[PDB]
Structures are given as C-alpha cells and as structure tokens.
Amino acid sequence: TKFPKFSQDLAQDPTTRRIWYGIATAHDFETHDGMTEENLYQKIFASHFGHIAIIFLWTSGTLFHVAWQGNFEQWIKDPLNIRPIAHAIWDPHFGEGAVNAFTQAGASNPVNIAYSGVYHWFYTIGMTTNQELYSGAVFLLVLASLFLFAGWLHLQPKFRPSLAWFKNAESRLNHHLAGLFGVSSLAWAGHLVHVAIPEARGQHVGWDNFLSTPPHPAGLMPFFTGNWGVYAADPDTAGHIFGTSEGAGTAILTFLGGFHPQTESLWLTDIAHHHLAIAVIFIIAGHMYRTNWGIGHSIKEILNAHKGPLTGAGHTNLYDTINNSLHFQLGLALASLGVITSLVAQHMYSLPSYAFIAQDHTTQAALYTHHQYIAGFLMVGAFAHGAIFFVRDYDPVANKDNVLARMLEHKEALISHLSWVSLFLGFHTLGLYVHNDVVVAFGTPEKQILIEPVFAQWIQATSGKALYGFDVLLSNPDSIASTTGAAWLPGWLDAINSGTNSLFLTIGPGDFLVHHAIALGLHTTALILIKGALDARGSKLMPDKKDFGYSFPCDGPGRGGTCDISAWDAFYLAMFWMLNTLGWLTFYWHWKHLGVWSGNVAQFNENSTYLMGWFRDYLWANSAQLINGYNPYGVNNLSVWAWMFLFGHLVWATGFMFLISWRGYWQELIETIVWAHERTPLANLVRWKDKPVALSIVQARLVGLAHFTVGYVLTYAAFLIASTAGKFG
Amino acid sequence: MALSDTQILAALVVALLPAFLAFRLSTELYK
Amino acid sequence: MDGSYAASYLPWILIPMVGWLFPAVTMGLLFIHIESEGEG
Amino acid sequence: LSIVIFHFSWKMQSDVWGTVSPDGSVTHVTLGNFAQSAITINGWLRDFLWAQAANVINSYGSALSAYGIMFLAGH
Amino acid sequence: SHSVKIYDTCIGCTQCVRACPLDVLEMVPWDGCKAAQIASSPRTEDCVGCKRCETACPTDFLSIRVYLGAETTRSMGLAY
Amino acid sequence: ALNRGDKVRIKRTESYWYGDVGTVASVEKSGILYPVIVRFDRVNYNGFSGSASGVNTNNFAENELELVQ
Amino acid sequence: FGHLAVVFVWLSGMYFHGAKFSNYEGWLADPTHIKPSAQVVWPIVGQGILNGDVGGGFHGIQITSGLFYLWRASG
Amino acid sequence: MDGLKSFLSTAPVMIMALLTFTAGILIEFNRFYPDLLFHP
Amino acid sequence: DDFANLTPCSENPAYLAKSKNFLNTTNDPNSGKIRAERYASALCGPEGYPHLIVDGRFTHAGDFLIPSILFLYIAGWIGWVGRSYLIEIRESKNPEMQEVVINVPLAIKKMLGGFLWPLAAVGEYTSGKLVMKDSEIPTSPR
C-alpha cells in the first residue's frame, strides 16, 4: 500500500494500525525514510510558511465575518450596552424556540455573541467603519497568498537554502531582533501616533489623507532639534471622551500612567512612547552579533568564556549543542513563549489596554482563561521536546563536564528535593483545608486557621498600595523612591489606590491558601516533566531506554512490570497535572473576579478558606442559570452553552475508557466481531482491506488523553461563559 | 454602512487565489 | 436559517457543500489514496 | 446499580412519597417532575442531582454536617 | 518483524529458549560461558514480542533484548 | 586478584548494583570472559510482575570491579 | 464458622447499642413523632453537634437501618 | 508463650498500638484543654 | 500601623457580636466563653475570625514560632529514633525479619534515647558518618 510514503514499515502493515500510525508520524520529519538534514530543514521552512499563512487566513476570516454579519458600526455607538456579534447562525436543525432565543443583540436573524474581545481591539486601534474591516480582510487574504507563494518558491530547486544558511545564528539573531522585533514595534508606534490617536481624538485619518495630516502641530522639527518635550505637552485631560474632540490634548508621547478615566484602559500616548522606546532598545540590541563585518560579538566565544571553578566546564561546547539540535531550540522557544503568554494573561487582566474592555467581564474572563491554557500547553510542550532532545540529540562526550552533563549528574538530588517540596506543600496545604472544613462544619468557624498573606501585601505596599499601612518605599511618601519626580507616579498611585479596577486586587487568607496550592501544582507538574526528561536516557529499571526511542509502550510484565516507563508516558501523566493546576488557577481567578464585579468580595473572602465553600458557593451556586438553558418550559440564549456543558461532561467521561480499559479485552472482542462478520450471509460479499485490530497501547493513551482534554476544556468554557453571561452579560 | 453583495462576491473571488496557491504548496510539500 | 445580511443566499448553498459535498468528496479521495495498493 | 438506585429514588420522591391532606389530596416530595424531566440527561443533571444535592451541600453547621463532610470525602 | 539480539553476557541457562512460545530462539555451541552455549534467534520472523525470553533471563541486565519493529500478520499474531 | 570473601564495588554502569558493594562468591579460571561471580545482599528487579524477590547474584569481568574489603 | 462468629458479634453489638444508647423505649410510645436513634457521639472536638434532636428530649444520631420497626414487629 | 509475644511484636500490632496511644494522648489533651489556636 | 486592615478582636464589632453564641466544644458548659476570651486577643478580619501573622515578628510568636519549635523537636525525635534503630538492626543476621517483627526491647531502648537528638545529630555530622559520600551510593545510569 502506498500510504504512508514516508515509512516503509508502516506501509507493509496489513492492519488498520497503518492508517493510525501513519497519521501520528506524518509531521515527524526526522524519522522519515531517507531523510537528510538539509531536506529536513527545507521542509520545516516550507511548513512554517504554511502555518503563518494559516494564521493570516484565520485573522482575515475573523475580520470578514465580523464586518459582514456583525454589528460593529452599531456597537461603537454604545460599547457599554450592546453585545458584539461573532457570526450569523444558519442551522436547518433549529426549531422555532431556538430561532427566537438566538435572535439577540438587535439582529434580524439568529446570531452569536462575540467573546474574543475583538470589537474593543478594533475600536482602540482606530477601525470605525465596516469598509475598513473589509479592506483589512482582503489585505490579509493577499498577505496569506504571498506567504503561501513564498513557501512554494523557497521550496523550488533554485531557491532551496543551504545547510549553512540555516545554521547562521548570529545573522538570524541580528535581523530578527533589530528588524522583526524592533522595526515592527517602531512601525506600530508610528501607526498609533499617525492614525490611532487622531481617531481616538475625533480626527478621522485614513490612507486618503494621512499624508496631508501631521500627527503633531509643531511636528518633525523638535525631534531633530532635540526639543522632544514639545511632543509631551498638553496631554489628554481627565475629562476626555474616547472618540471625540471634547477634552482631548495634542500630545503624542506621554508618561501619564494609570488608566483613562472613561475607558478604564491605558493611555494611548503611553502605549506610543512605550512601543517606541522598546523599538529603540531592540534596534540597539540587534547590532550585537558579528555577521560579516569586523564588529560584533560571537556567541561561541561568549559561551566558551563563561566557565567557573564550581561548575567544571561551564558553558563550553553549548553553541554546537544548541545549533545542531532542533529539539533544544524548540524546547527553549516553547518555554519562553509559555512564560510570556502567562505574562500576557496576568498583565492584561490587571492592565487593560483596549477601550471599555474592563467593563466586559465575560470577554476578560474568556481571554484570561484562553491565554493561560495556551501558556500551560506550551510549558508542557517545552519539557516534552526537551526530553525528546535528551533522547535523540544529546551527545555525552561533546557536552562533557559542562552544565548539561552536570544536570544528569545530580539528577537524583534534583528529583528527591523536588519530591520533598511537592509532598511538603501538599501535606500541609491539604491539612489546612481539611482542618478548616471540619472546624467550620462543626458549627464553630472561629477556630479556622487563617494566615494573612503578609509578603504579597508587603509587595503591594512597595508598589504603592496604601491599605495595609506598611508605609514602605512607594507607599512611603518620604522615601527616595517616591520623591524622584517620576511623571508616572501620580497616575500610577491614583490607579493602584482605587478599588474600582483589578490593579493589585486586595488579598486575604483564601488567596494565601490558593496561591500555595497553585505552587504545589506547579512544583508537581515540574517534578513529573523533569523526572521524565532526566530519566529519558535511562534508569535502573531500564538502563538502555534511549535505544528504544522516545515513545514505546512498555518492556513487558517482566522485571517488575514496566507500564509507562517511557518519557512520552511522563508527558502523558504531566498533562493531567497541568490541567488540574490550570483548573485551580482559573477557579480562583473566576470566583475572585465574580466577587469583585458583583461587589460582594466578602462572600469569597470568608468562604474560600474551606473547600465546602468552593463546592457550594462557586460550583453549585453559579450553575443555576447554565443548566436552565433549555427546560421543559422553554429555551433561552444559554441553551447552546448548556448543551456544550453536557457535551464536555460526556467527552470527559468517554476518555475514561480509553484510559482505564486496556487492549487485550478489545482485541478479543474484535476477534469475536470478525468471526460474526465472516460467518454472516449477505455480509460475506463485503470484506475489509485492512484487518481490524484494537488500538495500540500508546495510541489508546493518546486518544484517552485527547477525549479527556477536549471534555475538560469544553466543560469549563461552557460553564464560565454561561455563568458570566447570566450574571453580567 | 453594511456591505453589498458585490463586495462579498469579490472577497470570494480574491480568496480563490490563496486556495490555488495553497493547493500548489501542498502538492509541493507532499513531493 | 434566514438572514438579513448582504447576499443571504450564500449560506443556503455554501454550508451544504462544507457540510456534505466537501466532507464526502474528501472522504472518498482519502479512502482511495490510503487504500491504493502498491506504487510505494 | 447507580442508575437503578437513582431511578428508584427519583421515582419514589416524585410519584409516591409525600404528604396527604385531610381532604385526600397528595403532594409529592418533588411534585410530578419525573415524567417531564427524566427524559433528557439535562433533566437528570438539573432536577435530580443539582436540585436534591442542596440538602447535602447546605448541611454545614447543623446535625447533618457529618453527611456533608462525608459527601466531600467521597468526591 | 521484531528484532531479537543476544549479547556476550549470556551464561547459557537456556531459560529464554524454554520460555519462548513461538519457537524463535535456539541454543548454539559457544565458548564465552561455562555452559559453552549461547542463545540465537534464527526464526525471528515468527516473533510476536511477548518478552517472555526477556523475563526469563537471569543476568543483571537482559543478555537477550527484543526490539519491536515492523508489524506483519505474524507479528500481530492474527488468526484472521 | 579477587578471591573469595572480597568486598568489591561494581562499575558495570548498567547493572542493578552500580556503585553498590558485593562479595565475591566464586572466580572461574579459564577463558571465560565474565569469570567473577559476585553476590549481593539486595536483590534486583528480576522476576515477573508480582514476584516477592529478585536475583542476588551476577557475573562480572575483573576490570569492572574495585576492591574494597 | 469464623464468619458466623463475626456476624454474631455484629448482631449482639447492634442489640446492645439499641438497648443502652437508644431511645427505643421512648420511640415505642410515640412512633409517629419520635425519630429513631441508636448512636450517641461523645463531645470532644465539637462533634457533639452531631447529637441532633431526634424528638422526645433525646439527642443522638438518627439511624436509617430500620431496626426499631423490626424490633416492634418482633414484640 | 514465645509465639504470642512474637505475634504481638509484628508490624501491624505495633503500628496500631502506637496510633491508639497517640490518639488517646491527643484526645485527652483536647478534652482537658480545648481550642488551642496558639500559645497565648 | 502594621495591618491596617486587621483590627484587634477585643474591639471588632463582628467578633464581639459572634462571640456570645460560641458553641461548646467539650462537655464543659463554659468552653465557648473560654474560647471567646482566648481569641479576643487575636487580630480579627472584617468577618470576625482570628488571623495568624507569620513574618518573623515576636509579638505574634505564638502563631508560628512556638508550634514550629515543638513540631521540629518531635519530628526530629521520631526521625532520629527510626534511623538509629534501622542502623542498629542492620548489623544483625536477618535485618529484614526485624523490620516486620519489631525488636521491642531494642526498639524502646532507642525510643527513650531520642530526646537528645540535636546533640546526637550534630555529633553525627561532625563525625562524618551522618552523610555518605556520593561515590558510595548506588546510582542509576545517566
């Protein structure tokens, strides 16, 4: 059989497994038949072009559907009272009740309500009309076409890059720092000052008249004469109304700090100076490494020079290890991307940048949950692909006595102390929670163990939170740090001391307990991933694991039993802990913000100290409207979310039987079914081409994990959206 | 103001180009 | 199933192809390809 | 067996158990909601689990608190 | 088909050959051990990969190792 | 060199007793390429799933043992 | 024989705890107004709240095994 | 009897005896001095 | 000025309102009054329950420091007696049999000698036989 063309051993398989594994190893280019390094790199280049084109097409589709079936031009007239529309509904399976229920947001047909928060983003960046959205969609279509053609071209024989071109770290770093990061940020700052701010102040600026409309009145002379302060004079007053000329200043680069009084979001001019400054810094950074002139650093000598007397060989030979190994680079990139996605979530829920996005609680919750889940997935993938590197691309002799080898030396100490910290957190956190539960249940909630989060409150004070009376640093009015004449200090101190936003929310004993539980989850997931990565090469039970690859089922029932001794199994186990930690995180965030938005912070404050309050006040209480989306009486707009809630519960349940029941049972059952088919008249005329067999052990684990994760995500998303929409939306 | 039917049809026709380019890229990558 | 957006007749014809015609054609082509014995 | 005991409990509460008035009228524990709710899974989830779990989630501070504790223990 | 390898740490206890249910292994004369015999895998196309030979091996680490590879009808042990 | 009763440390780097200490139960003097027999107090993982014991004896070459006694 | 001995010990314990720590004599006079109860909880760490009011001035854990009705039927 | 002494000294008997000793200590202390949140 | 959000329980209106109806934990009829008295000196939140402050300050040493020292002493006692008994039985002829059948005489002899566990531990560390060298421990292949 032809398929799969990249693996002969799979193509000669006569069973249905050939269909499955061929899918699973399709995009693993290294293990393909007759694969060279150069071909691998070029194929990766083309595939990355493809993913970029897919991203651009997805964004174009978002824009086009919003412009076509949305209410963008009506939404901007009243962002605080109109639900944005995602896309239209066309379902012949609908009934009259569903049609009436889903005709919402002033539409004339069944429509969905957008929760990605793209309306606020488009409004903030200056898009105000449907035709602008349409032009953006068409331009993104053209851009995706260009990138697809670029992939095809650089895949052609005359345009195939050489191996040396791919292994040019210095030139890539210089171009991608100064150009990709710096020039793009500078262009965004120029877009903000030339277009976004004038449109926010009522002046319409487009391609038609942006050449005849200067950003600043006395423009482009002070920048070259050095009198930059002119661009900071006359900022937007506190009475400014977004999108109008009432109370609007003329400054284009400010450091006001805090939030816009009306939109409850960061000042646009602050964003302009911020992106300009980081563009300048990135452009400076991009002139660091030597490419083909005399000046510039070289990464290899920097790495080979930083060696100490305690670590042995230090960072020697690390340049070759990183450059020759693609999995090392992928793991580093995934770790960094996950960290900065977590950063995006944490600094975006507390410092909103888009106008009126702080008042749309549903979109805020959705965005936080989404980007935090993405960050968790990326953080898991970093460790997984690092373990893959250790299995495949790690050379012990080359990286001898350096830090990479030193990691595998005290790996037992690493795992032991990690196990100790995980157990130490878990025991004394579960003990405190159960103690509070038991004490509260016995009718004496006064004997609870409530620890004030003193250190985090001290940090809040050091940033300027004057509620705990710590009187330290920025909270100290006489401290040198608070008497530097910083232009952002008044606005920042005003915003931090206001209780109307999420900027440094007040904390208590429940936040202490839940943050320590999150710490337990993080350390346990790290323990699983790290032990898998370090034991991937081998352990006492399997000294020769590297010979068996990264993912293998087991080594049989002998020598104890094996049963998930591979590093792929470590990743598979760590996915569950990642999901559990993300669940705790999102539960804490959502309940705290429900209390904040309703003004009933005391409910969370006094009910989060014991687990029964979590079970009753959060889960039981907030499901009242969700599960009533469709009743024996009728149907409301939350019907789809109730259906998806049950759907997620069902898929989560279904994953359990790929996770618990194992292969031999189903193999024998399929044997019986095969007998039944072969012995049946009028069905013997039809025969299979691939012999039906049960799913393999690793495939079964993967499928169970997939159903599990899909159910988890769908259930929580449905519950969160339904609860927040019913409460506030 | 809301779009027109001609705009939607033109968007479809424009999107017909990245479809052809993506088909070519997929065939090239399969090779 | 009835909409007020411009060119509301498009989903009347586009969705079925994405619903039935495209999935069925893709099923048939992939099934033939993965089952085509030989030549690799 | 879980489905069996759930069916028994809900049907007993909805169609048999209850209070009889001196007139003779019968008011059931959960009224006649079994007939029109037990046909969908959402009905089983909302009118049986969520509705009737109130007495076990609100048991803290009273003589039934132990049950509530044990409830969580199971979970 | 799967691969079966026998390393020079074999002591010629013949437990692996006895434990094999599909007659894949054999005992051939040798000189490296006191028993002067070592295991062999001539009929390796019939191996299913049950790892019974590995379970039977008493050395500190298995002197006989089985590496699962391409899957055939025989390797899957199918009766249909 | 290694005789009966010799306490030796194992340096096979893949055996269960790498770094552990054992005692020389016997040495066979011929062309055998793993002539030393070392027995240990601890037992390895050898055995079917559920077995209550492992193996406390193994064969090693002379070069992979360090005399301690 | 051993399992029979264990079951006999269980039955004797049930009868003793229904004879000493129960309101069976109280419940017998007023069966429609007194809840059965045969387990009493020591007050040590606040678990004395489990000793709810089962009627008739008796404080104890309500039983659901139905031993009181069996004993009344047995005479 | 020596056999009875050896049986009494087995792991489960020792672990349960020590657990009841500790539990009795804690219960008696909590009875005679309850509600000790901190050293006052 | 520390803990501006935490007030003394002796004046917090919520604590005083809720302390009248404190439940009796034991059979003693005035255990609730004793608890209210003992907790009136703590730092109550807006909901009237005591809060423990753990930052190193000695004014609130009773919250963490004293129980910490008590637990550390007890846990060190337990660990030291267990380790000493293990090392002692390791020289016998059936160390595993004495693991499941406890040598009660020797067990209690080690039980009663654990109150000087810090001095024994520091002498052990100085003698160098508390911690084994890395080259004398079996290790898994890297």
Ligand code: CLA
């Ligand atoms: C990936 C982006 C994306 C997505 C998810 C959707 C989603 C949808 N569109 Mg849509 N659309 C998009 C981009 C997108 N659109 C773009 C860019 C255009 C301009 C050409 C349109 C034009 C369009 C029209 C004219 C109509 C829809 C309709 C619909 C709905 C019916 C289902 C469908 O797509 O089939 C029908 C739609 C198409 C087949 C449009 C072609 C798809 C685009 C052009 C290419 C996307 C390729 C994509 C990246 C492939 C990813 C591969 C990956 C899955 C492995 C659905 C909500 C219908 C609707 O409103 O029903 C209520 C409808 O009538 N779309």
Ligand code: CLA
């Ligand atoms: C019998 C049940 C049923 C069915 C058939 C549908 C069908 C539909 N609903 Mg719907 N709905 C239902 C019940 C149902 N609904 C219920 C009970 C509710 C709650 C009241 C809703 C609420 C609802 C809303 C709110 C919306 C719909 C929409 C839609 C349409 C989406 C178009 C589509 O699927 O293309 C897109 C197809 C896909 C995305 C495929 C995804 C599934 C596969 C498995 C993923 C692909 C995996 C893999 C890569 C496949 C490889 C390729 C393959 C060929 C091999 C479609 C007509 C939407 C609509 O009208 O917009 C057009 C919409 O907005 N429905």
Ligand code: CLA
């Ligand atoms: C100035 C020259 C230049 C530029 C612009 C690029 C640009 C790019 N190169 Mg590149 N490259 C260059 C020179 C350059 N290269 C040279 C000289 C070499 C040879 C040494 C290479 C060799 C090379 C290889 C080998 C590869 C690339 C690839 C890529 C693409 C990766 C996708 C990406 O990062 O974009 C997306 C990311 C960004 C735009 C910035 C990252 C986002 C930041 C970090 C955080 C987010 C900021 C902000 C908050 C997010 C916006 C929020 C908003 C949505 C609201 C990208 C388009 C890859 C590819 O295949 O692409 C086709 C690839 O594999 N490059």
Ligand code: CLA
């Ligand atoms: C830029 C990101 C990136 C890139 C380029 C790669 C690249 C690679 N990874 Mg990697 N990985 C990543 C992120 C990434 N990964 C992350 C974030 C994780 C953590 C989740 C992993 C976890 C991971 C593991 C555990 C393994 C790889 C492997 C691989 C290699 C090839 C096998 C493969 O993935 O194809 C095959 C991929 C698939 C068959 C994916 C199937 C899963 C589908 C997409 C789920 C679909 C869900 C379903 C449709 C939901 C329907 C919903 C509907 C009902 C509504 C390849 C080098 C494998 C390897 O060792 O190769 C060297 C391997 O074992 N990766």
Ligand code: CLA
């Ligand atoms: C609610 C369920 C639950 C719980 C409590 C645990 C608990 C634990 N898991 Mg775990 N796990 C779970 C679900 C759970 N897991 C699931 C679903 C998966 C996916 C398969 C995993 C996958 C997983 C992996 C892969 C790993 C763990 C690890 C751990 C340990 C880390 C230490 C810790 O968190 O606190 C400390 C432990 C606790 C708080 C639990 C003790 C709780 C009891 C009540 C203490 C008292 C015992 C009691 C007196 C016994 C009486 C019994 C008697 C009545 C018969 C711990 C034992 C890691 C580990 O071993 O770390 C060393 C590890 O590597 N687990």
Ligand code: CLA
């Ligand atoms: C199934 C049988 C059963 C069960 C579950 C109970 C359950 C109970 N009885 Mg009860 N009882 C039973 C049979 C049973 N009884 C019988 C047959 C009699 C008649 C003799 C009694 C007479 C009786 C009285 C007189 C009292 C109870 C009480 C109680 C309650 C307190 C628990 C208790 O006594 O522990 C108390 C704690 C202990 C016994 C711990 C002591 C240490 C133990 C024994 C450790 C065991 C090992 C020990 C070191 C000895 C070593 C042995 C080794 C050689 C093997 C509890 C609800 C009390 C109650 O309800 O008061 C309100 C009470 O006062 N029972």
Ligand SMILES: CC1=C(/C=C/C(C)=C/C=C/C(C)=C\C=C\C=C(C)\C=C\C=C(C)\C=C\C2=C[C@H](C)[C@H](O)CC2(C)C)C(C)(C)C[C@@H](O)C1
């Ligand atoms: C000796 C002994 C053993 C062994 C012991 C060993 C080997 C111990 C080894 C320890 C090592 C290697 C490292 C230890 C590190 C300890 C640290 C880092 C302590 C930090 C303390 C801090 C940060 C105090 C913090 C604050 C201190 C302050 C008083 C307040 O609270 C507030 C608060 C909590 C912030 C056993 C286990 C075998 C048996 C035992 O019985 C005895």
Ligand code: SF4
């Ligand atoms: S994974 Fe399955 S086949 Fe492998 S050892 Fe475990 S039970 Fe046996």
Ligand code: SF4
């Ligand atoms: S794996 Fe099984 S079939 Fe293959 S050689 Fe070993 S015992 Fe024989």
Ligand code: SF4
């Ligand atoms: S079981 Fe191991 S030692 Fe014995 S003959 Fe087979 S390979 Fe050699």
